Ligand binder design. Structure first.
Ligand SMILES: [Ca+2]
Ligand SMILES: [Ca+2]
Length: 219
């Protein structure tokens, strides 16, 4: 059901420091090559009064290139799909919590995202729009119980670093649990190398295009 070229549609509803917004977008990519693009539009609550960069990692793990000897748990979960739940703890106390549902309908992936950002300092780089994209990251994957049923799901941990417009960096610690909707084979521990670029945007980041390349490899 996962072809060599796949499209997706995404909707996000969120709030950051109480500012509510909605985003609708579409994407496409090559799931076995690990590459994908997305075009997002802010349909309500724009222009966003905070940095786009805290949203960009929430817009697609079916598109991670995996070697044949690492089970591709998230690809195997389809057509039913999977859910994920993420916490990002930023170094100045801001927090982003995300929940997401991924399914396959009419030959396309369907993503539904709910996001809540809290406690960003009013004078910090997120609320002041002083960020300039993510450095490449490495997510460390491992099987572990993330939902209290006693059975392992797939967990990931990332140390992420955002570049600052005025010079410097700004760090976040991220934990995600990925949960298949049907029983499928979990891998052992491995790592995923990820690089996400904003490839174009209008001046106020209400229409934004992203590109991501992601590849799983042995530890
Ligand atoms: Ca579990
Ligand atoms: Ca479970």
């Amino acid at each position: 059901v996962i072809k060599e070229f796949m499209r997706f549609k995404v909707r996000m509803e969120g709030s950051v420091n109480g500012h509510e917004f909605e985003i609708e977008g579409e994407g496409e990519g090559r799931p076995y090559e690990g590459t994908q693009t997305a075009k997002l539009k802010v349909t309500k609550g724009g222009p966003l009064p905070f940095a786009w960069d805290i949203l960009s990692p929430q817009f697609s793990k079916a598109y991670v290139k995996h070697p044949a000897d690492i089970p591709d748990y998230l690809k195997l979960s389809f057509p039913e799909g999977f859910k994920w739940e993420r916490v990002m703890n930023f170094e100045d106390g801001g927090v982003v919590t995300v929940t997401q549902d991924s399914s396959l309908q009419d030959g396309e992936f369907i993503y539904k995202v709910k996001l809540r950002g809290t406690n960003f300092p009013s004078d910090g780089p997120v609320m002041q729009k002083k960020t300039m994209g993510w450095e490449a990251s490495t997510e460390r994957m491992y099987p572990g119980d993330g939902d209290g049923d006693g059975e392992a799901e797939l967990k990931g941990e990332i140390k992420m670093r955002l570049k600052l417009k005025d010079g410097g960096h700004y760090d976040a610690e991220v934990k995600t649990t990925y949960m298949a909707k049907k029983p499928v084979q979990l891998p052992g521990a491995y790592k995923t190398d990820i690089k996400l670029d904003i490839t174009s945007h209008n001046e106020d980041y209400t229409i934004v295009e992203q590109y991501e390349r992601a590849e799983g490899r042995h530890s």
